[PDB]
């Protein structure tokens, strides 16, 4: 009922797993207004996440809508490797990585396309992704939001918005919703 | 709906 633990990989922090997954920062040119989904809001960290969800990310959308068959796994991939997990509360299948063991048991996991750090018990339903979907960059890019009450932004999560990219240090953005 | 809303955003 519980998955076999990762055989390898380097355990990382919440901050380091964001920096070690593949992100396409060229999709957010500085001093440009771009359209992207408000992936998630993290008021405690005073940051948000935006996701292009391009036509190039179409296969991730197919997996999200459960329109693609996947091979179920009984063994957890290495720490930092990208696979898929079934969220049956929302009945979606989302890309996920395990970044570290958890001090209270389980694992610290990161949903790379939402920008959400979650707890992973170890008995979840997980799938292997095809190599082309696994290699696609993480859609969620972290942003400091200016001219913005981040607390108010929860109403725009999972919704397309327009943001003006003030700064792009190729890790996180300084952007403003317009 | 939560994350399910994203489906309606990407359909």
Numbering used by the authors:
A (entry chain A): 287 to 464
B (entry chain F): 4 to 14
Question: What is written in the article reporting this PDB entry?
Answer:
Amplification of piRNA in the ping-pong cycle requires assembly of a tertiary complex scaffolded by Krimper, which simultaneously binds the N-terminal regions of Aub and Ago3. To promote generation of new piRNA, Krimper uses its two Tudor domains to bind Aub and Ago3 in opposite modification and piRNA-loading states. In addition to its self-interacting N-terminal region, Krimper contains two extended Tudor domains: eTud1(272-512) and eTud2 (562-746). Overall, our results reveal that the two Tudor domains of Krimper have distinct architectures that are responsible for the differential binding of two PIWI proteins.
Unlike eTud2, Krimper (eTud1) has an unusual binding specificity towards the unmethylated Ago3 sequence containing the (G/A)R motif. To elucidate the interaction between eTud1 and Ago3 we solved the crystal structure of eTud1 in both apo and peptide bound forms. However, the Ago3 peptide displaces the “latch helix” and adopts an α-helical structure to bind in the same cleft between the Tudor and SN-like subdomains, but with reverse directionality compared to the “latch helix”. The Ago3 peptide binds both a hydrophilic concave and a hydrophobic concave region in the cleft between the Tudor and SN-like subdomains of eTud1. However, instead of a conserved aromatic cage that interacts with sDMA in other canonical Tudor domains including eTud2, the binding of unmethylated Arg70 of Ago3 in eTud1 is provided by a mostly hydrophilic pocket composed of three non-aromatic amino acids (Asp373, Thr380, and Leu397). Arg70 forms hydrogen bonds with Asp373 and Glu402 in eTud1, supplemented by a cation-π interaction with Phe400. Notably, the side chain of Phe400 is rotated by 90° to form a stronger cation-π interaction with Arg70 when compared with the structure in the apostate. Adjacent to the hydrophilic concave region there exists a hydrophobic concave region formed by Phe400, Trp339, and Tyr446. The Ago3 peptide forms a hydrophobic contact with the hydrophobic concave region utilizing Leu73 and Leu77 that strengthens its interactions. Thus, eTud1 specifically recognizes unmodified R(A/G) motif in Ago3 using a unique hydrophilic concave and a hydrophobic concave region in the interface between the Tudor and SN-like subdomains.
